[PDB]
Design a protein around this ligand. Structure first.
Ligand SMILES: Nc1ncnc2c1ncn2[C@@H]1O[C@H](COP(=O)(O)OP(=O)(O)OP(=O)(O)O)[C@@H](O)[C@H]1O
Ligand SMILES: Nc1ncnc2c1ncn2[C@@H]1O[C@H](COP(=O)(O)OP(=O)(O)OP(=O)(O)O)[C@@H](O)[C@H]1O
Ligand code: NA
Ligand code: NA
Lengths: 307, 307
């Protein structure tokens, strides 16, 4: 029976790469790869290149849609070379790899003919300050929809896509586990804006950023695996981030593999997992493209929305 | 501050009509107008013509989007003259005029160059049978999301848009207040499919028909007015539909203006109003175009989604 989707195995997907050129060194893929991630240039070749090709085919097509409305509205023509920014959403669970997926994607798309301004904005900075979360009894729901200033987030994307000269987003510090005072990321009329976060794909009683997306990615994996990835990465961070005396979680550095595992699982059980199940996963159905990962972080399956 | 929307007054909207021809007689508008509706050829000129123009501009544009994905997928070209059907959703409250709005729209779009097959499907037929509603304790929630076989509805639209040769939908009888046994509406690869219902625009934890829409209309009016329209129409039906001895509500024909008013308001209070507030109105934010009506049924304002 008919389906809005079309699935592929990596062999199948690899072939749609067609002629697409690989413009990234292995030293560059590294500065994009997050701790624990297994992405290599091969995967970028058989998976991210076709995806970049697809996206570019749609970037031009997606604008005929706006032009039409512009033609209808009698309005003049586009603004000869400052089009409606193509907005891309990247969603997925904590520790699934989306952050890397988002960075690799921005790199590939920026290295394109004529060289388009491709900005990447994570929703981290749209989290409420710890003081504000403390006030709303939310310090233990960081990552849940309500922990974000979803209104500010919407004003931001709406602004950039509505053709603004520049827009600002706050900045979150992963070292201090909090929003950075006075800091800001400025975005100037990009050609493509990539928005990455746990729920970007959420719908609601109001127009949300998921409604402004022209294309969307959802990095997926078996829930047991992600937990394994989360915990492993947690243990792994004892000698990297947590090692730093400035880290809000420096006390974790001294944990034993054993107590660190216990600590990691508890956080996952009480926070990240509930949010994945209750909020993130239910948005997967409408992702333009879903990247399914095997326990080894390898992307070997894909589901595309043809409808 | 930027907005995804752009509003118009009828004067403003009237002008976007541009050159669009009026191909409907006043005798034809009548066979489309529902009891209580005040729509006339003037309104069709200053409101429905621009709208038809807009939609046609998008019908071609919207397909460059599919072609792109087809080009990417290596797939051959479209099927030379049986394109991806353009799906249009029309939503709104009971008694707001959408049913008429939907019929007038189908008429206008069918009377177009090359003459496209424009089918209209109301979600009435996707309601569960009274026996089935009785079983789910839903006979008093007819119109609410749960009273519809939303899965069958999705299979239907998915099927038509996925390029099916033909698809079937059940048929609802307004005379018998129930689904008609063995009846079916067959839709054959339309060029445009109009889907009209109370909630068509609903989103959820799963891919829904709102997600397959290429354009959407939401007929709006002040809630107090709609109630007035509902009640008036209810009274008015004592000498038309209810007069028929076959009517499931024939007993209403004998009501006095007074007890009929009481009866009408109760139904509105307990069913239609709650559903408008809790389910329909919350979907308005994402309608491509909203037709705002003044107490006299006159459309004098419009809100278009430019984003
Ligand atoms: N305490 C931390 N210090 C630094 N980085 C952290 C910390 N916790 C999580 N991270 C994340 O590690 C990410 C890079 O790895 P990856 O790209 O695999 O992240 P992820 O899977 O999206 O996980 P997360 O949602 O925690 O970022 C950075 O984007 C950063 O947000
Ligand atoms: N008992 C009834 N008998 C016949 N038609 C009815 C009855 N109740 C409501 N209607 C509706 O009257 C509609 C035509 O008028 P209009 O186009 O104004 O309807 P509407 O505002 O959408 O109201 P409704 O949702 O009740 O159809 C028909 O589509 C039919 O569904
Ligand atoms: Na910028
Ligand atoms: Na047909």
């Amino acid at each position: 029976e008919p389906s809005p989707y079309v699935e592929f195995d990596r062999r199948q997907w690899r072939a749609l790469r067609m002629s697409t050129p690989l413009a990234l060194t292995e030293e560059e893929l590294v500065g994009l790869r997050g701790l624990g991630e297994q992405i290599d240039l091969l995967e970028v070749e058989e998976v991210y290149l076709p995806l970049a090709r697809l996206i570019h085919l749609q970037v031009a097509a997606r604008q005929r849609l706006f032009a039409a409305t512009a033609e209808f509205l009698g309005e003049p023509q586009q603004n000869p070379d400052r089009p409606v920014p193509f907005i891309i959403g990247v969603a997925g669970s904590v520790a699934v790899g989306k952050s890397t997926t988002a960075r690799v994607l921005q790199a590939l798309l920026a290295r394109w003919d004529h060289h388009p301004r491709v900005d990447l904005v994570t929703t981290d900075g749209f989290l409420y300050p710890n003081a504000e979360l403390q006030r709303r009894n939310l310090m233990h729901r960081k990552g849940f929809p309500e922990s974000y200033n979803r209104r500010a987030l919407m004003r931001f994307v709406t602004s950039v896509k509505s053709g603004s000269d520049y827009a600002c987003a706050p900045v979150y510090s992963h070292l201090h586990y909090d929003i950075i005072p006075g800091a800001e990321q400025v975005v100037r009329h990009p050609d493509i804006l990539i928005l990455e976060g746990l729920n970007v794909l959420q719908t609601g009683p109001t127009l949300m950023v998921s409604d402004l997306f022209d294309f969307s990615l959802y990095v997926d994996a078996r829930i047991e695996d992600i937990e394994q990835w989360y915990v492993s990465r947690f243990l792994a961070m004892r000698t990297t981030a947590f090692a730093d005396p400035e880290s809000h979680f420096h006390h974790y550095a001294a944990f034993s593999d054993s107590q660190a595992v216990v600590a990691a699982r508890e956080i996952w059980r009480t926070i990240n997992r509930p949010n994945l199940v209750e909020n993130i996963l239910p948005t997967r159905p409408r992702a333009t493209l879903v990247l399914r990962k095997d326990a080894d972080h390898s992307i070997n399956r894909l589901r595309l929305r043809k409808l």
